Design a protein around this ligand. Sequence first.
Ligand SMILES: O=C(O)[C@@H]1CCC[C@H]1c1ccc2cccnc2c1
Length: 166
Amino acid sequence: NSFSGYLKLTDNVYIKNADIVEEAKKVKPTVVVNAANVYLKHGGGVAGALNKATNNAMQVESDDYIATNGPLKVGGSCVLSGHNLAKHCLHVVGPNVNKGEDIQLLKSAYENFNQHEVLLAPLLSAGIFGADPIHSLRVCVDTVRTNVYLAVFDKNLYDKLVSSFL
Ligand SMILES: O=C(O)[C@@H]1CCC[C@H]1c1ccc2cccnc2c1
């Protein structure tokens, strides 16, 4: 949890223009959040990048979790190993609004972060999930009560979020 270069947006939300994989490899936080789907198949977006950085150890562990426990619900989460990236990975499922899942479930998704005092995380439901990223930051701000360090890869998006939040 030795984060460097973040800007404090609210009492508990911090943001940085950084690759979440690089932030995890250097900081080794207690919790890194994955933007997962219900079967924990880490094919693209942040999930694909985190899994590749574990050289597929995350996917093998995720497949065993699913075979034993079944899929997650949209808005739900599970805690698995963080492997070489963190102590734990909190796999959280935001709604895929491009497939008709309700945007209301983005609040339920962010509610999972409140179970952990400090988290390194991406924006949920943004990117391949189709939600507006600034809307996702607003829901994070309105819902998360614990300390969250958001890593935003794209500089154009980062600048847009900071201008809209400040
Ligand atoms: O922070 C961003 O710019 C986006 C917004 C929501 C998903 C974020 C993201 C971050 C790292 C990534 C690495 C690899 C691939 N996709 C990635 C996506």
